[PDB]
Every structure is written in C-alpha cells, then in structure tokens.
Amino acid sequence: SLKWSAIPFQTLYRSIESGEFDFDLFKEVLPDLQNLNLNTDKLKNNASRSQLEKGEIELSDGSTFKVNQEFIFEAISLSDELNLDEIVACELILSGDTTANNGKVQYFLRRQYILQIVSFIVNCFHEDTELYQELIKNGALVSNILSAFKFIHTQLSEIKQQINKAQILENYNALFQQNIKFRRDFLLREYDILSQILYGLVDKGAIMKNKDFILSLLHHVSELDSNDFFIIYYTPAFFHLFASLRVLPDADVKLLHSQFMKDLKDDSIYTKPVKVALIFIFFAYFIGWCKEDPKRRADTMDFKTDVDEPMTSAVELGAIEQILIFAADTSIVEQDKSMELFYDIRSLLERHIPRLIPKQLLDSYTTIVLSDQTQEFFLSSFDDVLQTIITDCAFLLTKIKDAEEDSLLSGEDLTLDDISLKADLERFFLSIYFFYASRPEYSCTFWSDKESNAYGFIEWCSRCNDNLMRSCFYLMVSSLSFGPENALNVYHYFGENSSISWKNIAQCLSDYTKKISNFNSNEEAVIFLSSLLTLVGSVTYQVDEDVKSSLSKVFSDVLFEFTKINTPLVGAAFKVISNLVPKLESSRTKFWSFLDSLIFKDSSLNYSSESYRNAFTNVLTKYSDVLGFLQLFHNLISIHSRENNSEYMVFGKLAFPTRLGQGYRKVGIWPYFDYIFNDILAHVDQIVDIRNKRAVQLPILKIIYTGLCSFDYSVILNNFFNYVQECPAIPIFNYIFTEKIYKSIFNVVDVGVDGGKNQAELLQLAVKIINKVLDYQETYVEELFPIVKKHGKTDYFLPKNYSLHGLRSFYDAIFFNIPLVAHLGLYVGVDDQILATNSLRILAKLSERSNG
C-alpha cells in the first residue's frame, strides 16, 4: 500500500528543488510515484464503512484510532464526493491539519506532488541518471501514464453527475459551484503536468522502443471528441515524437508509415480529423528521415505512392484545417496591441472542423493557460512542426497553390462554404499567423536570415496573387511584425527586398478607392482591404517616428481619400491614420486639415451650434466610424511638446492649426468637443453592450484628461488672449460643468470594478479628471472664462450665450452626493496607486470645507 499523506511527497520534492535527493525516501515512496494519480484499487468500499462507522479505524502502516462523529462525516463526504476508500480517506484527514475539508486538500496535493516529481525527474535528469533509471525500470510508470489521463476523464464526469444531481435538487448553490471549480482546477493542473511527463518520456526515449506505444496513444487520443481541447495536451508528445523518428528502429518507422496509408483509405478516418493531422505531420517528418539515411530508406521508396499521394489525401481530409485549429485555439494574438482584424477570417477558413473547447470542464472556463513548462514544450515542438512543413514540404505547397488558382470559376454564385473548400494554402498562412502572433522570440526566425527557408517561404508567399492568398499573406505578415524589432524588418521587407512594395500596397488601396466611387455614379474587397489595413496598422504602430514618417509619405493621402468613401472600413482606416500621426504637434497640420475637410465638406452650417454637430453626425454614422474617429482625435490632440517633467503642454503651444476651418466655418477646435461631449459621451450611458460602451468611454476620458493638461495653468497661479481662446481646455471645462457630462464621469466612480483590467483604467481616468477639475475649477472661472467671454473674438466658434453653468450642480452632485464621497473613501486603501493617491487628493480638497 501507498503512503496516503502529502508531506513525504512535499518534502521529497523540496529536496530535489535544491539537488538534495535522498535515495532513502525516493526508494521508499517509489511505487507511489509509479502509480501517479491513480487510486486504482482502494475506491469506495462498504467493508470499510462498517469498519469506520464503529468509530475505531485501522491503517495499513500499523497503529489505530478512536474516531468521533464530526470526523466520520468529513470522511464519508470524501468517499461519496470522490469514489474513494473510507480508511484511505481517513489517513488523508489525519495527515493534514484537521480543518473544514482538509482531507480533500491532502488528496489533491498528494497527487499534484507525485506528478510534479515524476515530471521533474523524467524531464530534468539525464537518461543515464540513476533514479531516472529506477523510476522507469519496472516499466510500471509507462503502463499507467495513459490510465492516468483516463482517470482524470472519469473523475470529470463523476463531477458532472454530481452537478446534475445538485440541479434537480436545485441545491446547485454558490458554494457547490465553488467546491467544484476547486477540483476541476486541481485536475486541469494534473492534466497539464501529465502532459510534461508524456513529453519527457519521448525525449528520454522510453516510449519509442517500438511502434506499440505510438499506436496505443494514437488510439487513446482518437477516443476524445473532435472538439475536446484536451487534445492539445498530447500535441507536445506527438509532435516531438515524430520529430525524433531516428530514435525508433527503422524496422518500425517503416511499419507505421504503411499502417498510416492504410488508415487514410479506411472511410471513417474523416470523422477523426485529429488522426488525419497527426498522420500528416508524421509524413512531413518521414520525408526528412528517408533522406537522412538514403540507401536503406529513401531509395526503397516511391515518392508519388509512398508520400505525395497520402499527404495529398490528408490535406483533402482537412489535415491543415486541424493544424490551423490547434494554432488558433492556443494563440495569444489577443495580446498584440497593434493587431486588429476587421473581417472574420477564421470563419471563412475554418468551416468543416469545430473549434476546440475544454468541453469536459463546461456545463466557467472562457480561456485556458498552460503551465510555463508546458507552454515551452508546446511552442518549441509546434514551431518545429510548422518549420519542418516549410522546408521539407514545398512541393505540397506549390501543388496546392496551383490547385487553388484553377478550381473556382469566374461568373458563378460562390458561397462562403465554396470559397473555403479549397482554401488549404490560406489556412496554412493563418496557422502561421495564429501561432507566431505575439511570440517574437520565434516570429524573428522568418526575418533573421535572408538565405533561410523561412525567409524564402515569405518571398514565395509574396508571389501568390490570388486575391484571397494575397490578403491572407498580408495578415500573416502582420503577425510577424510583432517586435519593435520585427516591425522594422517588415518595414524593410516591403521597402527594400521584394516584388511587393509599400507603394504597390497604397496603389491597390487607391485603385479600389476609384473602383468603389465610380460604381456609385462586395465581400471580396472587404476581405482584401480589411487585410491591407490590418497590416499597415500593425506596423505603423510598432515603429519609431522616422519610419512612421516615411510610411506617412506613402499612405496618408490615400487613406484620407479612402475614408471619404463610405465603406464599412472607415473606422478601420481612421485607426491606421491615427498610427501615422506624428508626435510633433507641428507635423500634424496635414492630418487636421484632412479631418476638418472630411467633416465639413458637405456640411450646411448656419447660426446654430446644432449645424456643426450635424456635420459630424452625418459623416460619422456608425459605431465603428465613431470609435475610429475618437482614436484619431485622441492622437491628434495628444500632448507631446511638454514642459520638463510637468504634464502640461508647454505654455504657448497648440496641437492643431490656428484658426482651424478658416474659410468655411466659424473656426477653432470647439465644435469637435460639442460633438464628442453631447452627441456621444452624453449617450454612452445607453449603449447596448457593455464592452462597446467601455470601448468609446475610454478614448473620451483620455481625451478629456489630455485637454485638461493641455494648457499650462501654473503660468498664471505662479494674442495670449487668442491662445487662451484657441485652447481646448476651454470648451472642455465648459462641458464638464453641463450636468449630463459630470454625471457620467461621476458614475464611473460610483460603480468601479464590476474591459476587465481595462475597465479599471477607465476608473483611474475618471478620478484623475475630477481631481484636475477641482485643482483648476477656480482658474477656469476667474482667469479663463472671462478672457474668452470678454476678449474672445467672434470669427470663432463661440456660443452667443457662453456662460458659467453648473458651479452649484457639479458641486452638489459631488459634495452633497454621498456614495461618490464614500466610494472615494473606499478607494484610498485599494492596491492601484493612481486610483488611491488621487481619490485621496479629491477627498482632501473636499475636506477643506471640513463638515457635513
């Protein structure tokens, strides 16, 4: 029997942390380790319930104990909760300090340690090593590894039975859901550490003595559903196993090869698309293995019958669709803050195999992480798969390329399903895009060396002209311009060494622009354009100002012309333009001109402010338009030229042209803030879907705050009339005091954390803004307001009735509003410094009225 504590296994592991392995304890608990997580004999007994329900119980390691009734109930809650033997369940409560459910902890900690140890040994110690050799040597470990995965499966169903039992009773409360997340967690960790062990056993060679394990594993994996994300946890072992085919005796490599071609002719193979993929990868690797010992291997073989015919078969059975899905469902492209997709490409390309979801944990798991140790084996092994395919499979790529250029016929009603059918090459491009996105430590392989196959691969892909391949190419490269360092190569790649040049790209964009407005005097174009923009976006973001500045020479004027047309891609172009906007305020004049033309070209202005708000609301007619507009504006009014370690725009400077709009309207920046405040911020508090509410709230708050820092106040505390009038800080104060405006800024503070860590920023901004207003409320009312009111010139946007408003409204809704004051109170403690140290500043100002 096994020592059912978790303290021998904790301390053993800690020894090894610092190379203190005592052969003593290790040799003691050896067979417990070989058993991994299994409790394969001692499950729930009733010959052990009578034993327990007397109150006197006996352990296998000697002594016995008197057991009261509180203990008996913790112990049968274990056996009923975990189909576990009752006296085992008791050794487990004894071993770990008796508190409310600490037997359930020792059960899981015991297993977790075991697994981690095995994993440490089979992955950090050498193969010749003494214990690696002890551990493996019975071969009892190898015969349990697959069982140990299956055990996790059965338990996760045990859990779902239990769940379902709880719902029929309607006892499916909060604290049930919680003692399940607790176990579903411990198990997912076990699966993830069992991934490591399996991989380790491949790299150590233990499961590669012959073809037997591979086939049995390949079976085991094929039992899961085609969309069980648990498949991923076997990909490191399988990927690396095929990539060390040399370890196997040739005799057996040959037998698998044969086996597999037989498998691809079996009919019901196509309902196991994961086998198809794995097989296909085997072939990608086999190729190189034949070539490594030609005389005995390669020369034996006929390439058309022994390789190309089957690989082709696997591609037609969706082998690539499955690689894309592996790639995409582990991708961290959501982290790429420069990347933005404007068209759902994954739904055009993946239409035959389901997305992977951790369905044995579902019925609260949106996205899953892999351990560091596992992320590393996966990434490394899979990168090696993608690159093997690149170098060793060029013939298949050209085969497919050529296939596709021929298949679809002009003059037909193509459906998305039709367009996707043969798009196997484009799928492979997307596999690259998902897998390398945000992973610069690998992305860089493509650009690192101009001889390398990877770099060649790119040159090749850059000559596929098929509109869909061309756009998928554009997307792929955006993924690969991730670093500040990769972005710069991608900048060179189109400037210097290729058939496609930055100018050609703008030239496409220009041509489409003509075609589109002439038609008015299509999905294929959305796909192409959306990708063009996705790419120019990604790079323009990630590069310095010089480089930004050249790309502007190429793209600004054409992007400008494109947003004049009404596409659904206006917003998208706006986001790109904004990436090109330079830091120096001086250099922004061409962009401000653009935008003011855009808004006011077809305007019918008159005496009313409303006329100017309509200019905006006629043009910026849909959500995406607005959102893009706000990012552009946010960048155009941003403060770069600032006083040394202040945050205030150096006294005297503006972020835009003097007398903006001169010649076609009452001039100046004011109307922009009329739109932004009243036409938009006023109405976010009734935007449909929260994530989009936040998506527009947050630009606006950033803008508002920028404006407030946008005039050096302390020149006064511690033609200048004109500067004061031109300055955005004026209209910004003027609307902050409208109530609809200070109310919305104030709720942000009422309901806080409730985006995600994006929503938490929106909150800091809210607070910082209010503080800033209090600091300078005074300075606006004495200095600024009158300067403008009294010496403001009238060829500007300046309301007839410009006045002070909500001095009493803003205060009474702040000072007399309570829960705001209370909420602020409750923030002084919170972790966030920006939130706390500002909340405190607000309270201190308020505090200087002293009393209620």
Swiss-Prot record:
GO terms for cellular component: nuclear envelope; nuclear pore; nuclear pore inner ring; nucleus. Its main location: nucleus. Keywords: Coiled coil, mRNA transport, Nuclear pore complex, Nucleus, Protein transport, Translocation, Transport. One of its GO terms (biological process) is nucleocytoplasmic transport. The keyword Nucleus applies. Residues 32-59 form a coiled coil. The keyword Coiled coil applies. It is found in: Nucleus, Nuclear pore complex. GO terms for molecular function: structural constituent of nuclear pore. It comes from the Eukaryota. Belongs to the NUP186/NUP192/NUP205 family. Present with 2520 molecules/cell in log phase SD medium. Functions as a component of the nuclear pore complex (NPC). NPC components, collectively referred to as nucleoporins (NUPs), can play the role of both NPC structural components and of docking or interaction partners for transiently associated nuclear transport factors. NUP192 is located to the NPC core at the nuclear membrane and is essential for de novo assembly of NPCs. Component of the nuclear pore complex (NPC). NPC constitutes the exclusive means of nucleocytoplasmic transport. NPCs allow the passive diffusion of ions and small molecules and the active, nuclear transport receptor-mediated bidirectional transport of macromolecules such as proteins, RNAs, ribonucleoparticles (RNPs), and ribosomal subunits across the nuclear envelope. Due to its 8-fold rotational symmetry, all subunits are present with 8 copies or multiples thereof. NUP192 interacts with NIC96. This is Nucleoporin NUP192. The chain holds residues 2 to 954 of 1683 of the full protein.
